[PDB]
Amino acid sequence: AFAGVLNDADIAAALEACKAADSFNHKAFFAKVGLTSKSADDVKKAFAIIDQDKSGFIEEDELKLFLQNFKADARALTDGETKTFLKAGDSDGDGKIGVDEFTALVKA
Amino acid sequence: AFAGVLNDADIAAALEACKAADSFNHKAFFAKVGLTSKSADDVKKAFAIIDQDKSGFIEEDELKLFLQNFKADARALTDGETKTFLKAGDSDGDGKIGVDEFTALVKA
Numbered sequence: 336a337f338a339g340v341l342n343d344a345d346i347a348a349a350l351e352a353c354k355a356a357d358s359f360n361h362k363a364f365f366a367k368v369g370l371t372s373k374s375a376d377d378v379k380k381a382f383a384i385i386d387q388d389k390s391g392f393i394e395e396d397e398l399k400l401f402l403q404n405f406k407a408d409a410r411a412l413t414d415g416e417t418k419t420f421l422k423a424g425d426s427d428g429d430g431k432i433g434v435d436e437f438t439a440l441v442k443a
Numbered sequence: 444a445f446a447g448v449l450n451d452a453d454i455a456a457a458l459e460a461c462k463a464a465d466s467f468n469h470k471a472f473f474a475k476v477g478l479t480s481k482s483a484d485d486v487k488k489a490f491a492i493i494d495q496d497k498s499g500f501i502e503e504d505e506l507k508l509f510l511q512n513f514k515a516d517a518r519a520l521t522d523g524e525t526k527t528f529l530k531a532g533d534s535d536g537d538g539k540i541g542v543d544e545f546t547a548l549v550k551a
C-alpha cells in the first residue's frame with residue numbers, strides 16, 4: 336500500500352534484508368524503506384495503513400502483519416519479533432501502538 | 444580479520460545494513476555476511492577472532508566491538524545492541540559467550 340509512496344527499490348531492499356526468521360529490526364527497516372526522513376504528516380499516513388481496522392491503534396495482530404503492508408506476499412513477523420517491536424513502541428504499556436508512539440518509533 | 448574468509452561484498456553489505464544506531468540484528472548480520480552456512484570448524488575460527496584476548500569467551504567489551512572484527516573502521520554497537528546480543532547468546536547466564544553458545548547463535 337506504499338509501494339507508491341516510498342520507492343520500490345528501498346522497499347525491496349528492506350524486505351530482502353529481513354527475510355530470515357528473527358532477522359527483523361524496526362530501526363533498520365524504517366531507515367532502509369525511507370520512512371525516518373518523512374514528515375509527521377506522511378508518518379501519520381503510514382500509521383493509518385498499518386492500522387488495518389482503523390481502530391486508531393496498531394494492535395499486536397496488525398503488527399505481526401507489518402511487512403505485508405509493504406509487499407503483500409511478505410512474511411509474517413515471528414512472535415518473538417512482534418513482541419520486541421511492540422515493547423519498543425508501546426510507551427504507555429497498553430499492549431498497542433497509538434499514533435504518537437508510532438511517530439517516536441519511526442523518528443528517534 | 445575475515446575480510447579474507449567471508450567475501451568482501453557480503454561483509455560490506457552486512458555493515459551498510461546496520462549503520463544506523465540500534466539497527467543491528469545478529470541473525471540478519473550472520474545470514475548476510477555468510478557465517479550461518481559455515482562449518483562448525485570455520486565457526487570456531489570466527490569465534491577465536493572475536494575473542495580478542497583469547498580468554499575462551501567473548502566478554503561484553505569484545506561484543507561491543509563485534510563489527511570492528513569485520514572492518515576495522517566499523518562502529519561500536521550501542522549498549523542496547525550489546526545487551527540484546529549478549530542476552531540472546533548467553534545461555535548459561537554467566538554474562539559472557541563461550542564457543543558452543545556462539546555456535547548456537549550463528550546456526551539456529
Ligand SMILES: [Ca+2]
Pocket residue numbers: 386387388389390391392393394397
Ligand atoms: Ca488497529
Ligand SMILES: [Ca+2]
Pocket residue numbers: 424425426427428429430431432433436
Ligand atoms: Ca501504547
Ligand SMILES: [Ca+2]
Pocket residue numbers: 494495496497498499500501502505
Ligand atoms: Ca575474550
Ligand SMILES: [Ca+2]
Pocket residue numbers: 532533534535536537538539540541544
Ligand atoms: Ca555464557
